[PDB]
Amino acid sequence: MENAHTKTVEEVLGHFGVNESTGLSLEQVKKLKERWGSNELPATLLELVIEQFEDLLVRILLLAACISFVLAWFTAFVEPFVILLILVANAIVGVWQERNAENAIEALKEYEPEMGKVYRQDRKSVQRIKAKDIVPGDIVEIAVGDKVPADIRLTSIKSTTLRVDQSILTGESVSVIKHTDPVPDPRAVNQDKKNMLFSGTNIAAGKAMGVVVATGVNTEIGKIRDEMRTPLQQKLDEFGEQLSKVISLICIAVWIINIGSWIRGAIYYFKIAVALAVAAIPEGLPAVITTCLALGTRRMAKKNAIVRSLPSVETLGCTSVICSDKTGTLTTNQMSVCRMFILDRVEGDTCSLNEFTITGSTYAPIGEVHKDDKPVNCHQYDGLVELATICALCNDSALDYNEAKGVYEKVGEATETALTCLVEKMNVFDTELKGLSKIERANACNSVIKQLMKKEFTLEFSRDRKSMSVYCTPNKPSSMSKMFVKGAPEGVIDRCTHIRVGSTKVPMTSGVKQKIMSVIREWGSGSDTLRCLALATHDNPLRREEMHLEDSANFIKYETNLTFVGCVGMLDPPRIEVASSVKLCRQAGIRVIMITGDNKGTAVAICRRIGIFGQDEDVTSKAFTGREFDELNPSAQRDACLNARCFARVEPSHKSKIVEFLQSFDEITAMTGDGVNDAPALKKAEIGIAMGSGTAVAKTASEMVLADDNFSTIVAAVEEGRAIYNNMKQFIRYLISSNVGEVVCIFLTAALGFPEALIPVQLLWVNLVTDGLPATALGFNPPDLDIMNKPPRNPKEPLISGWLFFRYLAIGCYVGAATVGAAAWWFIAADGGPRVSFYQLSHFLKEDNPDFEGVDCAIFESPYPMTMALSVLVTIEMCNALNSLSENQSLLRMPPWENIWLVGSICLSMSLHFLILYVEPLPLIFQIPLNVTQWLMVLKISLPVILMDETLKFVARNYFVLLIMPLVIWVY
Ligand SMILES: Nc1ncnc2c1ncn2[C@@H]1O[C@H](COP(=O)(O)OP(=O)(O)CP(=O)(O)O)[C@@H](O)[C@H]1O
Ligand SMILES: [Ca+2]
Ligand SMILES: [Ca+2]
Ligand SMILES: [Mg+2]
């Protein structure tokens, strides 16, 4: 079947020989799966390796590896080789971490098979099957929120209008409108295919059914499968540019003051200002950020949270407002009518009711109606036969038994599905239900109703009108059509001009209208926090011939002069872990707002339950309806958002505008939503969160999907986001505060006229050792002990602080007055070696010199005090690295064994530094045999940078040993 849209409806129905209302036979599926395979897709090798070197810091440090190798034919290659080993080492961590997380996100999406609603011949009702079991033939049904599972030709549209979001397939950011007439153009583009749906795209409004015409690869989305920065990064890429600007400054600022063949020898000092450049250049800044960001995506994918955009975690470390949809998201969406009432009698102003309770918290259609905790037969209550009529004929939902889980599931919206379940429990027509199975009883009594009443068309739901009409005619006429409605109570009773009392109608009164809203206030504020709907019927509707449904704004006009019948009260439990989250957030410095279209009375009562409010807290300033907000003065309407914690009876435009107002206050907002109404607010907010059980359009439009439906996962992402930015700051403090020393070790050396500090092969070794995997592995750092007890980060404030700058000199100056303080100790105050005086040492730049009496000028050509400064900078920078586990938490509170990966790193970079000083062929390649008398001093010197930085920690903070102390006692 090619170009179905050329062909008409019955044509494509003939091609598969299916009845539209029956669907595909059982072996017809067997054959067709043997002719088109499943409905799935079978999902570079070294490209990840090459992507690491695409960053500025390793693009330029790829040059220094070839510049010092330019001079190879002129040790010579040991300089460029050591620049590789720090670039190669960091580049391997990232590709490792990246492939770790990749499998994870692909492990979680695979957990949940995408179901899809078909019409095979076994069950007389719609049923949910795995997407891959769909074949080109069976009738398929979809509705608002559903992703399309296969390529479908439309056959019938139940709602007035159908709206598909084809963005993922075509890119058009608008919802198109479909039809069922044939498009003749046989080469028409996907966008001009207005009678077809395609996998992966979602339904924005309406509900319809068609027949599959392609699967797997043959679908438009499959046909093109093989042919297809972050807010913290721009903060670091404005940094990576600036340091190199100062690096190459200071570096060539070294190269000049030294030169003063006398010019061919000026190319030595070039490899210095080049190697010293690589030394104070963070080769691993772009690797350590791709590391941590990949890690979190793996951390979250572990907790049943698919992260769809990588900066989601980063921004969540700063969120100060987390708005959330009530129904579905903050509630389990496990609905069942447990209270209902109709009118008993009405005499004058006063009136009485006939209330009822109904058992059964599950969607399962088992339960009984009580009057006063006593069961009753509903046929005796004439008003109940009608409430039951409305509740099954205004339903776009249906019950579907899941024989795998042995439990009942919903087909459509939970709210509607609770009603289908209720009309089963009533059985107002007293049909004999004894001989029917767990599947026949999912939609049993509705069928009797739907068999007595011909539903000719429905006027679908509209969240601004907040009600849903249905047109019907009895099957034996003579012409007596009627109209049934169900909608928001406040709204429906507004349009109700009459009330039915049993089987008779009477005009609406003030007092009657009162009682209703009190029951509903009783119901929504009670221990159950009921979610209530009104149910009324129009007795003299306008003929279908004289109706105008092209403009849906007419719908509310036709739903007028109604007869009120009754109200239902369904229960909705809050999610279990939710009351903890709002406790955890108010401590992390985060506000939690509720945005809902339901009753303010009920929405507040939930907020009282879960801890947004408390039963006694006055809420007059923190809860406003949609109307109570737009009907305010702009100043009070301003500081409302500042303090309001609940917004109810609210359309998606509001939630989109609510988040907007938060953001206009420089607030970083998160949005937690389940359904279509949350779609604008999800995109609008900085980050949107969708529920796994929710809709696809809610999931697609949002940027992180809790497939768990766990609500405490949100907090964990905020800890990840706060932990990633915090790992940077220490990593920042390490390389930055440690290289002020490598510059002063050189610049102090020049100012005092001292002997040579280092050599360009030594300059790039100590870069490798301290700035290789040791520095890099700082990203696995343990989250701080009090990370979620402090307000969130404000992104517009700068990265580095003036107290932190001061802490970089206080360790940069020290590691420099320690790198050169050890080489001067071997010339002035050492036992085995020269006793050169300070004056004699600074003017060393002759046998004739009487100031240099009794000294072989050859002692300045000795590698001894060079590895006294080389192994001091390695040891002291491993020490400073051990300071860099936390900004202020000392090593008494955060011991170094908590970070396993900086430990296993420092031990590897000392195993590679100790292997260089005592092996056979290396002390000559590196110009360098140090033992106990000298290694104790390098310990005596490199260790105080532990305490010196510790005393910085102790002062900013106020505004183990069995192992530690024997090591120090040897030293002193
Ligand atoms: N299929 C449906 N038919 C008739 N009325 C419906 C309906 N679905 C919802 N309503 C009514 O619309 C009103 C508001 O609906 P809306 O879609 O804006 O939010 P909501 O009630 O579904 C709760 P939440 O916003 O937390 O998901 C509800 O009070 C309900 O009475
Ligand atoms: Ca470096
Ligand atoms: Ca360094
Ligand atoms: Mg919802």
* Token pair listed for 172: 């058009």
CB-facing half-sphere around the CA of 887: CA atoms within 13 A:
19
Beta carbon of 700 within 6 Å of any ligand 1 atom: no
Helix then strand then coil, in percent of the chain rounded to 5, is: 50, 15, 35
Report the CATH number of the 9-36+136-214 domain: 2.70.150.10
Beta carbon of 488 within 6 Å of any ligand 1 atom: yes
Closest C-alpha to 393, from 425, 419, 369, 426:
419
Ligand 3 centroid, distance to 739 Cα (angstroms): 5
Please tell me the residue having the least CA distance from ligand 1 atom 12. 466
Closest C-alpha to 324, from 694, 70, 67:
694
- Asked if residues 676 and 145 have their Cβ atoms less than 8 Å apart, the reply is yes
Beta carbon of 598 within 6 Å of any ligand 1 atom: yes
Place of tokens 């297809």: 228
Annotated binding-site residues read 278-279, 281, 283, 325, 327, 416, 463, 486, 531, 596-598, 649, 655, 674, 677, 739, 742, 767, 770-771, 877
Ligand 3 centroid, distance to 768 Cα (angstroms): 8
Q: How many CB atoms lie within 10 A of CB 625?
A: 19
d(CA 565, CA 528): 23
Ligand 1 centroid, distance to 651 Cα (angstroms): 10
* Token pair listed for 602: 């009920």
Kindly give the pairing relationship between strand 669-673 and strand 687-691: parallel
* Token pair listed for 880: 């400073």
- Asked if residues 523 and 530 have their Cβ atoms less than 8 Å apart, the reply is yes
d(CA 611, CA 254): 63
Annotated binding-site residues for Ca(2+) read 278-279, 281, 283, 739, 742, 767, 770-771, 877
Q: Which helix H or strand E contains 587, and what residues bound it?
A: helix 578-588
Using the 8-state DSSP alphabet, how is residue 583 labeled? H
Ligand 1 centroid, distance to 608 Cα (angstroms): 21
Beta carbon of 145 within 6 Å of any ligand 1 atom: no
* Token pair listed for 884: 């860099």
Would you give the distance in Å from CA 311 to the centre of its chain? 9
Instruction: List beta partners, residue 486.
Output: 468, 535
Residue type, 644: A
Ligand 3 centroid, distance to 280 Cα (angstroms): 6
Max CA distance (Å), the chain = 135
d(CA 22, CA 14): 13
d(CA 240, CA 916): 32
Residue ranges per structural domain of the chain: 9-36+136-214, 52-98+232-294+718-787+798-823+863-971, 306-331+575-709, 336-571
d(CA 234, CA 245): 17
CA angle 897, 902, 906 (to 5 degrees): 105
Torsion of CA 655, 658, 660, 665, to 10 degrees: -160
d(CA 689, CA 324): 9
Would you give the distance in Å from CA 21 to the centre of its chain? 41
Please tell me the residue having the least CA distance from ligand 1 atom 27. 327
Task: Name the region of 231 (left: φ>0; alpha: ψ -120 to 50; beta: rest).
Answer: alpha
Beta carbon of 675 within 6 Å of any ligand 1 atom: yes
Beta carbon of 487 within 6 Å of any ligand 1 atom: yes
State yes or no: is 181 an active-site residue: no
Closest C-alpha to 141, from 154, 124, 132:
154
Q: How many CB atoms lie within 10 A of CB 21?
A: 10
Ligand closest to 86 (CA) is: 2
* Token pair listed for 718: 């905020």
Question: What are the phi and psi torsion angles at 500 (to 5°)?
Answer: -95, 135
* Token pair listed for 150: 């296969």
Ligand 2 centroid, distance to 776 Cα (angstroms): 11
Q: By three-state DSSP, how is residue 8 classified?
A: coil
Closest C-alpha to 567, from 505, 473, 496, 464:
496
CA 487, 489, 490, 496 torsion: positive or negative?
positive
Q: Label residues 512-536 b or e (16+ Cβ within 10 Å = b).
A: beebbbebbeebbbeebbbbbbbbb
Pocket test for ligand 1, best of 411, 459, 535, 598 (most atoms within 8 A of CB): 598
DSSP 826-846: HHHS-SSS----HHHHHS---
Using the 8-state DSSP alphabet, how is residue 463 labeled? T
Using the 8-state DSSP alphabet, how is residue 574 labeled? B
Q: Which residues contact 76 (CB under 8 A, 6 or more apart)?
A: 68
Q: Which residues contact 733 (CB under 8 A, 6 or more apart)?
A: 804, 807, 808, 884, 887
Closest C-alpha to 499, from 552, 432, 562, 418:
562
In order of 326, 439, 613, 670, 923, the CA distances from 595 in angstroms are: 7, 37, 14, 12, 70
Would you give the distance in Å from CA 18 to the centre of its chain? 43
Q: By three-state DSSP, how is residue 651 classified?
A: coil
d(CA 338, CA 885): 56
Beta carbon of 151 within 6 Å of any ligand 1 atom: no
DSSP 295-345: HHHHHHHHTT-EESSTHHHHHHTT--EEEEEIIIIIB----EEEEEEEEEE
- Asked if residues 232 and 725 have their Cβ atoms less than 8 Å apart, the reply is yes
Question: What are the phi and psi torsion angles at 68 (to 5°)?
Answer: -65, -15
- Asked if residues 572 and 552 have their Cβ atoms less than 8 Å apart, the reply is no
Q: Which residues contact 789 (CB under 8 A, 6 or more apart)?
A: 587, 588
Residue type, 274: V
- Asked if residues 85 and 772 have their Cβ atoms less than 8 Å apart, the reply is yes
DSSP 215-234: -GGGSHHHHTSS----TTHH
Atom nearest to 651 CA in ligand 1 = 18
Q: Which fold is adopted by the domain 52-98+232-294+718-787+798-823+863-971?
A: Calcium-transporting ATPase, transmembrane domain (1.20.1110)
Ligand 3 centroid, distance to 829 Cα (angstroms): 28
Ligand closest to 83 (CA) is: 2
d(CA 411, CA 141): 10
d(CA 758, CA 735): 19
Closest C-alpha to 645, from 599, 593, 681:
593
| CATH classification (class only), 336-571 | alpha beta
Angle between helices 78-108 and 285-302 (to 10 degrees): 20
Closest C-alpha to 876, from 951, 813, 955:
813
Atom nearest to 674 CA in ligand 1 = 27
Ligand 2 centroid, distance to 59 Cα (angstroms): 15
- Asked if residues 819 and 741 have their Cβ atoms less than 8 Å apart, the reply is yes
CA angle 704, 710, 715 (to 5 degrees): 70
Domain range 306-331+575-709, CATH architecture: 3-Layer(aba) Sandwich (3.40)
| DSSP alpha helix (H) spans, 496-577 | 510-525, 555-558
Annotated binding-site residues for ATP read 327, 416, 463, 486, 531, 596-598, 649, 655, 677
C-to-N gaps above 2.5 Å in the chain, after residues: 43, 74, 228, 260, 478, 845, 928, 959
CA 597, 599, 602, 605 torsion: positive or negative?
positive
Please tell me the residue having the least CA distance from ligand 1 atom 14. 597
Ligand 4 centroid, distance to 692 Cα (angstroms): 12
Using the 8-state DSSP alphabet, how is residue 856 labeled? -
Kindly give the pairing relationship between strand 321-325 and strand 591-595: parallel
Q: Which residues contact 364 (CB under 8 A, 6 or more apart)?
A: 407, 408, 421
Q: Identify residues whose C-beta is under 5 A from ligand 3, the ion.
A: 738-739, 770-771
Q: Which residues contact 621 (CB under 8 A, 6 or more apart)?
A: 640, 643, 644
Beta carbon of 678 within 6 Å of any ligand 1 atom: no
Beta carbon of 201 within 6 Å of any ligand 1 atom: no
- Asked if residues 781 and 900 have their Cβ atoms less than 8 Å apart, the reply is no
Catalytic residue among 133, 325, 708, 949: 325
In order of 385, 480, 645, the CA distances from 469 in angstroms are: 18, 17, 33
Closest C-alpha to 355, from 516, 468, 160, 595:
516
In order of 813, 831, 838, 861, the CA distances from 828 in angstroms are: 21, 9, 7, 16
Q: Which helix H or strand E contains 208, and what residues bound it?
A: strand 207-214
Ligand 1 centroid, distance to 597 Cα (angstroms): 6
Would you give the distance in Å from CA 500 to the centre of its chain? 50
CA angle 12, 13, 16 (to 5 degrees): 90
d(CA 56, CA 528): 60
Elucidation technique? X-ray
Beta carbon of 672 within 6 Å of any ligand 1 atom: no
Closest C-alpha to 588, from 803, 798, 790, 821:
790
Beta carbon of 463 within 6 Å of any ligand 1 atom: yes
Ligand closest to 275 (CA) is: 2
Beta carbon of 490 within 6 Å of any ligand 1 atom: no
Atom nearest to 328 CA in ligand 1 = 27
Ligand closest to 770 (CA) is: 3
Burial of 235 (0-12, 13-18, 19+ CB in 10 A): middle
Closest C-alpha to 726, from 812, 669, 804:
804
Rg (CA), the chain: 37
Atom nearest to 326 CA in ligand 1 = 26
In order of 90, 92, 95, 226, 509, the CA distances from 46 in angstroms are: 16, 12, 10, 18, 78
- Asked if residues 946 and 879 have their Cβ atoms less than 8 Å apart, the reply is yes
Atom nearest to 325 CA in ligand 1 = 26
* Token pair listed for 719: 């800890």
Instruction: List beta partners, residue 129.
Output: 116
Q: By three-state DSSP, how is residue 806 classified?
A: helix
Ligand closest to 650 (CA) is: 1
Place of tokens 């109703």: 449
Atom nearest to 488 CA in ligand 1 = 31
Burial of 257 (0-12, 13-18, 19+ CB in 10 A): exposed
DSSP 235-267: HHHHHHHHHHHHHHHHHHHHHHHHH--TTGGGG
Beta carbon of 329 within 6 Å of any ligand 1 atom: no
Please tell me the residue having the least CA distance from ligand 1 atom 5. 487
d(CA 509, CA 98): 68
Ligand closest to 731 (CA) is: 3
d(CA 591, CA 137): 51
CA angle 850, 852, 853 (to 5 degrees): 70
What distance, in Å, lies between the first and last C-alpha atoms of the chain?
89
Pocket test for ligand 1, best of 325, 677, 693 (most atoms within 8 A of CB): 677
- Asked if residues 99 and 5 have their Cβ atoms less than 8 Å apart, the reply is no
Annotated binding-site residues for Mg(2+) read 325, 327, 674
CA angle 292, 294, 295 (to 5 degrees): 60
Burial of 187 (0-12, 13-18, 19+ CB in 10 A): exposed
**Three-state helix/strand/coil letters over 87-148:** HHHHHHHHHHHHHHHHHHHHHHCCCCCCEEEECCCCCCCCEEEEHHHCCCCCEEEEECCCEC
d(CA 289, CA 286): 5
